[PDB]
């Protein structure tokens, strides 16, 4: 459980690896995997779609029940649902959609949700379909999260760019 290997250490508590988050989940057996979600938990073409496909759509069905019962999340908020076959829990976190003009300051609130869990496998929030500057997302993570976060960045071009400017 929580057996993370091959990650580069960025700070005392933040680590990064060039990998698919789904493949990492199957190897590391994490207590918590983080999804980069929207307020409707409608799992689209990035990390959310990859995680969902790996559960054979069970994540989406559970998400449909959560949303019908509780209504949409707020931007910067989160909820904990099952991790199905990938993890004990999935922490669904909503970063701001910068492509739709949502406030970038909400990325700090988004990463604050990680602080409620001792160890997480996670993606870089808002850095794909939501269009935020990935260098900013990584630095906000580093400056906000105090628990142990292992970031899986599937895009090798981006991984190399983040590592080169960070170290
Ligand atoms: N690298 C990388 C990626 C990425 C893509 C696929 C994978 C993978 N299999 N393993 C690891 N990483 N990874 O991880 C980052 C997050 O990008 P992502 O688009 O998921 O999140 P976001 O918060 O921007 O947008 C939320 C909306 O996207 C809908 O999926 C969802 O339902 C919401 O509507 C980007 O750098 C992205 O290139």
Residue numbers in the entry: 3 to 169
What does the paper say about this structure?
Macrodomains are a class of conserved protein domains present in various cells and some viruses with diverse biological functions. Viral macrodomains that can bind to or hydrolyze protein adenosine diphosphate ribosylation (ADP-ribosylation) have emerged as promising targets for antiviral drug development. Many inhibitor development efforts have been directed against the severe acute respiratory syndrome coronavirus 2 macrodomain 1 (SARS-CoV-2 Mac1).
Schroder et al. discovered that GS-441524, a metabolite of the anti-SARS-CoV-2 drug remdesivir,12−14 binds SARS-CoV-2 Mac1 with an affinity comparable to that of ADPr. Interestingly, they found that the cyano group of GS-441524 similarly occupies the oxyanion subsite by interacting with the backbone NHs of Phe156 and Asp157. Thus, it appears that the oxyanion subsite of SARS-CoV-2 Mac1 is a “hot spot” for binding that is not utilized by ADPr but can be actively incorporated into the inhibitor design. We wanted to explore whether converting GS-441524 into the corresponding NDPr (3) would further increase its binding affinity for SARS-CoV-2 Mac1. To understand how NDPr binds to SARS-CoV-2 Mac1, we solved the X-ray crystal structure of SARS-CoV-2 Mac1 in complex with NDPr using diffraction data to 1.4 Å. As expected, the binding pose of NDPr is well-aligned with that of ADPr, except that the 1″-CN group of NDPr forms hydrogen-bonding interactions with the backbone NHs of Phe156 and Asp157. Compared with the co-crystal structure of SARS-CoV-2 Mac1 with ADPr, the nearby β7-α6 loop moves significantly to allow interactions with the extra cyano group of NDPr, a feature also seen in the binding pose of GS-441524. We were pleased to find that biotin-Ph-ADPr and biotin-NDPr are ∼50- and ∼70-fold, respectively, more potent than biotin-ADPr based on the Kd values, demonstrating the beneficial roles of the 1″-OPh moiety and the 1′-CN group in binding. A good dose–response curve of Ph-NDPr with Hill slope of unity was obtained using TAMRA-Ph-NDPr as the tracer, yielding IC50 of 3.1 nM, which was 6000-, 500-, and 100-fold better than ADPr, Ph-ADPr, and NDPr, respectively, measured under the same assay conditions. Interestingly, this cyano group is detrimental to the binding of human MacroD1 and MacroD2.
